[PDB]
Amino acid sequence: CGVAGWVSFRQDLSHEENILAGMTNSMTCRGPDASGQWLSRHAALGHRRLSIIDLPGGTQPMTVDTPGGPVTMSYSGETYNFVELRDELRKRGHTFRTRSDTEVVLRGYLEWGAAIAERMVGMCAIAIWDSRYERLTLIRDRMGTKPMHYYRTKDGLLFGSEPKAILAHPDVKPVVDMEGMRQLFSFFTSSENAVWADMKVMTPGTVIEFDRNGLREHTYWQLSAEEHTDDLDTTVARVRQMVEDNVRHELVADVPLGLLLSGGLDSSALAGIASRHLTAKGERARTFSVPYAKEMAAHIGSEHHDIVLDHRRLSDPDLRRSVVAAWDLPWGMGDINGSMYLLFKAVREHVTVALSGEAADEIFAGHVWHQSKAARYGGTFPWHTTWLKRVDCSAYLTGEFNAALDSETYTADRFQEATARVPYLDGEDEEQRMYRRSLHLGLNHFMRVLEDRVDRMAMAVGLETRVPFCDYRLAQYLYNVPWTMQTFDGREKSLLRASVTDVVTPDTLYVGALQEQVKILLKEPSSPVFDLFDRSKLAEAAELSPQQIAGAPRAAFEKALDLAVWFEIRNPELRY
Structure with missing residues (x-):
């Protein structure tokens, strides 16, 4: 709605x-x-x-x-x-x-x-x-x-x-x-x-x-620090009970309902639990994929759909217009935004509701920045330590704008406010404290952007996305569970895997298109994009072989093309 x-x-x-x-x-x-x-x-x-x-x-x-x-x-x-x-x-x-x-x-x-x-x-x-x-x-x-x-x-x-x-x-x-x-x-x-x-x-x-x-x-609600009395066996049992209860309740609709199967332990867990509960109305589950995904489809016995996306379809400028229009802002993530747009557009042709396992990684400490000590003990957001280094397009900004941003000071100030908000129990050791902080920042910064992404894209095509894992009770509970239990198998989402052991059974061309679209843009140097981005550095980056371009320049291209579109459809007044 x-x-x-x-x-x-x-x-x-x-x-x-x-x-x-x-x-x-x-x-x-x-x-x-x-x-x-x-x-x-x-x-x-x-x-x-x-x-x-x-x-x-x-x-x-x-x-x-x-x-x-x-x-x-x-x-x-x-x-x-x-x-x-x-x-x-x-x-x-x-x-x-x-x-x-x-x-x-x-x-x-x-x-x-x-x-x-x-x-x-x-x-x-x-x-x-x-x-x-x-x-x-x-x-x-x-x-x-x-x-x-x-x-x-x-x-x-x-x-x-x-x-x-x-x-x-x-x-x-x-x-x-x-x-x-x-x-x-x-x-x-x-x-x-x-x-x-x-x-x-x-x-x-x-x-x-x-x-x-x-x-x-x-x-009326925020994550609180509370004593965890339940042992590993009970903690695994309770997680299943909560995930199951959530899935069951969220399957209720007066319209056709589907599932998003990516093959990962997250999607496969929701699919297996949903399949068992949909069977309770003889309802044949309807899965949708953008390897392990096709395997789980046969296990559930679902009406599977393999949505195939070519670099041409992901690069289409018309897609980037639709994506930016939905977002209202140029985020420059065309790859992971256009993909789930075309995914949800294909899903909409069949079903009006869809279940996703999106919040799983954020509640079950799944991501690599949950696991890496360097990231958890860093003086900035964990996901900045692991990824930003590559994705940072700040080299490709006009020094005047880059110096005016002061992204390092902004990130530092925002991180201080973010760590301050983190509720700790008294007398907790460093490992337990750094775990809480990791999980809090994940749920109150990273997960919020994904939620809004999943929402904007899904609602742009008129699809209702549901998120069984993205629940306050399940978040509250797992926040108070000791780090020891979350990685008791010596792997990410060990409490998730242990709870869902019965139901679950074990491009270069795209970049060439971005460079061509950027060369088109460079042809018109009047564009307000070049007030933010350095024209000379984009031309230099656009001139390179697609194989050479990787990380920061790729991020720079996706940002610049989004900005180009943004300036035409919304016509903002930048006070810069």
């Missing part, structure tokens, strides 16, 4: 439908099935809907009339405990016209107010306007699976799932300050700064309230 809207205590928003439409319909991709509008004096809520649970009933924005006036909500996500919560609400005297999770969350707010955030389990980006208190409430899920942005106005607020929703407003100029560019040229780090000037990204597991008094933010 795609949530947008506008609050003001200065202007009458009763008849500003055309503006609200401009914000909402910009995310038509997110929800192609339907669109809705609810307008009032102080609040205007829009919604783009991808119908998953209850097609005719789950119409948004949904409104519940109260003695004090209407309570309208715009909701983008999936509450997996909407049956349990509806039973709890029925006992408290609530009557339900729909069989949608949407109504449960809205009547949930009627019961518990903002505290509904603490009772929901799954992914969500919610916008509630309460006419009783003339107060907006914005709720984002605990891990940050569903996005929400906001933009302060004079005695008012603009919000949307994607920046394009806010940018579509005529009182918002597309401005990017130096703090914006620093986050844009940042490498897999979370920030409130949404690159766009004065536009912010909602912190996962927070509720933003907005009324006449101003804007308020409350953290």
